[PDB]
């Protein structure tokens, strides 16, 4: 039941999502191995994802978490990068979008740095890169990220 609404570059909503994308680029300790060498993006398109069922699924669980945490969902806007971005917008997040070998265990990982999620768009550590050129640093191929509403509730704080 998903529909994608294309946002106008002149829309303030497009503009503030582009700004969160652009302003949260950082340098990576891998010097660009996984996600490529760049300081900024060419944003080609921003679509709002609309699914009644996946939204009601989300707000049901958000109410449960806030009631367990002094009416505080502790909701964030976080970046997610995956080669299964098309299955995620259609069927929502589930066990099959977990990273099983992750530092914090088998879960769904999100990032405050867009450039961190960018490392995961072609797979774990950028996989073998873009499907067409096998280039983890491809400046040609179109990449996709999700900007997601994430309910954190009571977060367990793990230091590096």
């Amino acid at each position: 039941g998903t529909i994608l609404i294309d946002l106008s570059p002149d829309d303030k909503e497009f503009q503030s999502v582009e700004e969160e994308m652009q302003s949260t680029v950082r340098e990576h300790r891998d010097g660009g191995h996984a996600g490529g060498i760049f300081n900024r993006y060419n944003i080609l398109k921003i679509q709002k994802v609309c699914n009644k069922k996946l939204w009601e699924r989300y707000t049901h669980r958000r109410k449960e978490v806030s009631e367990e945490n002094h009416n505080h969902a502790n909701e964030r806007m976080l970046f997610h990068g995956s080669p299964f971005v098309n299955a995620i917008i259609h069927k929502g997040f589930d066990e099959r979008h977990a990273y099983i070998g992750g530092m914090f265990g088998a879960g769904i990982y999100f990032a405050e740095n867009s450039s961190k999620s960018n490392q995961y768009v072609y797979g774990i550590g950028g996989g073998t890169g873009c499907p067409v050129h096998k280039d983890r640093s491809c400046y040609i191929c179109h990449r996709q990220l999700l900007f997601c509403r994430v309910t954190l509730g009571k977060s367990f704080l793990q230091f590096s």
């Binding site: 405050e112 990220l145 999700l146 367990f156």
Partner: protein, 47 residues
């Protein structure tokens, strides 16, 4: 999928070496995230 630590709904990976890094987050329930924006982009070759 695993479960959150007892008493907790998520983990926060707080960076503690890299000065410039921001946080990573993990949830253990798919229902605890909604994908609101699909962004199509290219990375840009610097000067």
């Amino acid at each position: 999928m695993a479960h959150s630590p007892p008493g907790h709904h998520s983990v926060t990976g707080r960076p503690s070496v890299n000065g410039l890094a921001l946080a990573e987050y993990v949830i253990y329930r798919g229902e605890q995230a909604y994908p609101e924006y699909l962004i199509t982009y290219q990375i840009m070759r610097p000067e």
